[PDB]
């Protein structure tokens, strides 16, 4: 190769992302140990679906089966986004209202577009809807200009009559971002149903953005993960089930945030996104449109 590995950037779930050098540029190389072949094959099949060339989805370069028995590593080469992920960005920066609006609209744009069935993409073919299945601020990367890029499709599932998937399990996502349906183990293998599970998680990602924005007044608090403040960064299926399902709670929307006309309307939108009733949640496309028209306020 002229592929030259440089440094570890992210420790992913089933794989590990290296900054790497290719030709005169950088590329991200995710390395799967050989027991995670089926995450590498899942993830490469998603990237290989028609119409996945899109400004707000991570871009695919190559998948390499580096060898034969017991030596085999599985490499997946995508574009490298130096600015990194949204969660670490939020960890170290407080963002402007224009930046929030831009990351919110491009992030819902890339999600609505993942979610979208496109009868035909020229030279390529049918793009079915795709549910992410692990949507979170770790999995939203950021361009130089803060444009959102969705990443990490190792759990994504296509809704394509006739091309079925492999083993698809019920509770596969990061626990903190799990819709109550999911926590309770109750999930129809239907497109609308999975989409709405993604939308509950984008709701919490929106919250995270709002929580580190300069909100024309009060001080801005240090970044926390959804529910890190209520239970832990981690604690289990059982505590989330209390706080999220039984007691009905969500990350606090601060009173003083409501005195900004933009943030007031974005929080209304968040609350519809993370509604207990799955059927009451907005689609990604309706969030993209909302965000656009709030910017315009
Ligand atoms: N985790 C990551 N951080 C930065 N750039 C990436 N490009 C692909 N994955 C990436």
Distance of CA 256 to the CA centre of its chain: 28
For the CA of 10, the nearest atom of ligand 1:
1
Could you tell me the resolution of this structure in angstroms? 2.0
Distances in Å between the alpha carbon of 220 and those of 54, 101, 206, 209? 33, 17, 16, 11
Which residue of 13, 79, 89, 143 sits with most ligand 1 atoms within 8 Å of its CB, as the best mutation to test the pocket?
79
The 3-state secondary structure of 60-105, one letter per residue:
EEEEEEECCCCCCEEEEEEECCCCCEHHHHHHHCCECHHHHHHHHH
Ligand 1 pocket member 17 (CB < 6 A) = yes
Report the C-alpha gap between 120 and 174 in whole angstroms: 32
Cβ neighbors of 16 (< 8 A, separation 6 or more) are 8, 10, 30, 31
Judge whether 117 counts as a catalytic residue.
Answer: no
For the CA of 12, the nearest atom of ligand 1:
1
Technique used to solve these coordinates: X-ray
Cβ neighbors of 238 (< 8 A, separation 6 or more) are none
Strands across the sheet containing 25-32? 4-10, 16-22, 25-32, 73-79, 60-66
Alpha helix ranges (H) inside 218-283: 237-240, 261-273
174 closest CA partner among 222, 246, 244: 244
Cα of 60 vs centre of ligand 1, distance in Å, is: 11
Q: Does the annotation flag 143 for ligand binding?
A: no
- Would the CA dihedral through 94, 96, 97, 100 be positive or negative? negative
181 closest CA partner among 240, 132, 224: 240
Ligand 1 pocket member 40 (CB < 6 A) = no
Report the C-alpha gap between 115 and 270 in whole angstroms: 18
Report the C-alpha gap between 250 and 226 in whole angstroms: 8
For the CA of 27, the nearest atom of ligand 1:
7
With 0-12 CB in 10 A as exposed, 13-18 as middle and 19+ as buried, what is 88? middle
Alpha helix ranges (H) inside the chain: 37-47, 86-92, 97-115, 180-183, 191-211, 237-240, 261-273, 284-295
Is the separation of the CB atoms in 32 and 74 below 8 Å? yes
Report the C-alpha gap between 60 and 77 in whole angstroms: 6
Q: Does the annotation flag 11 for ligand binding?
A: yes
Q: Is 119 left (phi over 0), alpha (psi -120 to 50) or beta?
A: alpha
Cα of 80 vs centre of ligand 1, distance in Å, is: 5
Is the separation of the CB atoms in 230 and 238 below 8 Å? no
Cα of 21 vs centre of ligand 1, distance in Å, is: 13
2 closest CA partner among 17, 18, 21, 27: 21
- What structural domains and CATH numbers belong to the chain? 1-82 (3.30.200.20), 83-297 (1.10.510.10)
191-211 and 97-115 helices, crossing angle to 10°: 170
Cα of 139 vs centre of ligand 1, distance in Å, is: 9
Cβ neighbors of 127 (< 8 A, separation 6 or more) are 49, 50, 51, 52, 116, 117, 118, 121
Catalytic residue among 134, 152, 198, 275: 134
């Amino acid at each position: 190769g002229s592929l030259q590995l440089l440094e570890i950037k992210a420790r992913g779930r089933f794989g590990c992302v290296w900054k790497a050098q290719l030709m005169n540029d950088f590329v991200a190389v995710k390395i799967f140990p050989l027991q995670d072949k089926q995450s590498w094959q899942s993830e490469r099949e998603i990237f290989s679906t028609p119409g996945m060339k899109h400004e707000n989805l991570l871009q695919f370069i190559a998948a390499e089966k580096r060898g034969s028995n017991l030596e085999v590593e599985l490499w997946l080469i995508t574009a490298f986004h130096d600015k990194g992920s949204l969660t670490d960005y939020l960890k170290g920066n407080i963002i402007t209202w224009n930046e929030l609006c831009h990351v919110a609209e491009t992030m819902s744009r890339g999600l609505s577009y993942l979610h979208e069935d496109v009868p035909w993409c020229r030279g390529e073919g049918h793009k079915p809807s795709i549910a992410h299945r692990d949507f979170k601020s770790k999995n939203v990367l950021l361009k130089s200009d803060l444009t959102a890029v969705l990443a990490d499709f190792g759990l994504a599932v296509r809704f394509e009559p006739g091309k079925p998937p492999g083993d698809t399990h019920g509770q596969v996502g990061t626990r903190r971002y799990m819709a109550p349906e999911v926590l309770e183990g109750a999930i129809n293998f239907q497109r609308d149903a999975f989409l709405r599970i993604d939308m509950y998680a984008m709701g919490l990602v929106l919250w995270e953005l709002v929580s580190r924005c300069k909100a024309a007044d009060g001080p801005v608090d240090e970044y926390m993960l959804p529910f890190e403040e209520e239970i832990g960064q981690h604690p289990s299926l059982e505590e989330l089930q209390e706080v999220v399902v039984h007691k009905k709670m969500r990350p606090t929307i601060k009173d003083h945030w409501l005195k900004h006309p933009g943030l007031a309307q974005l929080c209304v939108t968040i609350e519809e996104c993370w509604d207990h009733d799955a059927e009451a949640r907005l689609s990604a496309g309706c969030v993209e449109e909302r965000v656009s028209l709030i910017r315009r306020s």
